[PDB]
Amino acid sequence: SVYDAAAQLTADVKKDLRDSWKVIGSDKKGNGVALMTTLFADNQETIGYFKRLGDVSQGMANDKLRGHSITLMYALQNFIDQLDNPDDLVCVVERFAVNHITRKISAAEFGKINGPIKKVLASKNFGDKYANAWAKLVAVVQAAL
Amino acid sequence: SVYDAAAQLTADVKKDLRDSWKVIGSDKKGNGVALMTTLFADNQETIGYFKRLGDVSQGMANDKLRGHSITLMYALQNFIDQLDNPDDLVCVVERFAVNHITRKISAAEFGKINGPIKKVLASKNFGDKYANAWAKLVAVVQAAL
Ligand code: HEM
Numbered sequence: 336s337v338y339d340a341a342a343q344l345t346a347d348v349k350k351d352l353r354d355s356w357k358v359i360g361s362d363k364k365g366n367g368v369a370l371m372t373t374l375f376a377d378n379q380e381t382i383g384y385f386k387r388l389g390d391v392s393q394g395m396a397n398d399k400l401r402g403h404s405i406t407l408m409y410a411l412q413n414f415i416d417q418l419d420n421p422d423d424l425v426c427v428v429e430r431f432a433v434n435h436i437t438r439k440i441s442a443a444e445f446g447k448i449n450g451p452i453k454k455v456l457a458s459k460n461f462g463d464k465y466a467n468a469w470a471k472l473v474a475v476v477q478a479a480l
Numbered sequence: 481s482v483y484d485a486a487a488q489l490t491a492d493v494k495k496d497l498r499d500s501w502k503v504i505g506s507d508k509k510g511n512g513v514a515l516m517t518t519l520f521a522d523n524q525e526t527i528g529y530f531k532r533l534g535d536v537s538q539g540m541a542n543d544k545l546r547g548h549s550i551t552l553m554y555a556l557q558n559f560i561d562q563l564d565n566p567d568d569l570v571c572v573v574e575r576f577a578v579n580h581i582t583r584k585i586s587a588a589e590f591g592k593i594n595g596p597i598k599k600v601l602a603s604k605n606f607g608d609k610y611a612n613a614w615a616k617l618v619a620v621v622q623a624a625l
């Protein structure tokens with residue numbers, strides 16, 4: 336369950352999540368667009384899911400893609416600020432999951448975000464240990480999908 | 481249009497937004513549920529829109545409502561963080577608009593939020609000048625509906 340998944344994020348994982356977010360979160364426009372573009376480059380099959388965003392090849396130039404990327408970063412910001420209270424983390428994760436469930440995104444597909452996140456972290460000198468801490472947070476959301 | 485609305489956000493207006501958000505933004509969960517509950521009390525005509533949240537009268541105890549309130553606060557967070565770049569502000573307000581547009585929320589409906597905001601601010605010692613500042617931020621979203 337979502338609680339089980341969340342309830343496991345240990346004090347060390349919370350620390351790595353926060354430390355890394357201090358950096359990749361300080362520049363939401365840049366990193367967020369980086370996440371999306373990388374996701375499209377490595378998993379072309381997901382481009383169709385974003386038809387409403389227009390031409391995603393435009394990158395930073397596409398306002399729809401830019402506004403979406405910035406907003407996505409605030410969803411993560413929200414998850415990070417609720418790390419100390421499982422109760423709050425869970426209920427916010429639940430609301431969030433609804434959007435991707437109606438979007439027909441399965442747990443396995445949503446998991447594809449791991450690759451990109453890993454690459455954005457690396458570009459900032461945050462190795463495997465950190466990528467793993469993020470896969471745990473991503474796992475909490477997967478438990479609600 | 482939206483851009484003309486964004487221009488209304490002058491140095492003073494943006495300054496008042498930041499100064500107040502610094503206080504009401506430190507307790508997203510607290511102030512978030514206050515806005516929501518103040519709305520349902522001053523405008524029972526809108527409760528129908530939040531059928532999915534269940535018994536909103538419950539307040540903080542309602543998990544679905546609490547998660548929604550918190551998330552709502554991050555949306556505003558996103559707007560305040562884009563006050564320097566109207567371009568960024570506009571693209572995010574647009575993505576945001578698409579959410580309520582699909583919920584059949586008209587600009588007239590959205591404007592009803594000004595009342596609650598004004599009351600939450602006042603409970604934190606923020607007067608009309610401040611409520612007038614947020615009124616303009618809200619108008620940007622309205623021009624996008
Ligand atoms: C780190 C994980 C992710 C986060 C935080 C996230 C965040 C978001 C947010 C906040 C929205 C809606 C924003 C708005 O409407 O203003 C959204 C929508 C959506 N997401 Fe994600 N997402 C994530 C991963 C994914 C993945 C992996 C996929 C695809 C394989 C995906 C597919 C979608 C789709 C189809 C929409 C609808 C976009 C539209 O048509 O406007 N998301 N996401």
Ligand code: HEM
Pocket residue numbers: 430431434526529530532533548551552555556579580583585589590591592593
């Ligand atoms: C301060 C202004 C407002 C902000 C920043 C705001 C923010 C939000 C956010 C972030 C969501 C949830 C996004 C998601 O999870 O998909 C949302 C959903 C919604 N909003 Fe607003 N909103 C505002 C005012 C209003 C007003 C005035 C109404 C009603 C007259 C309204 C009606 C709705 C409805 C019906 C939903 C969907 C609820 C659900 O099914 O979970 N909003 N809003």
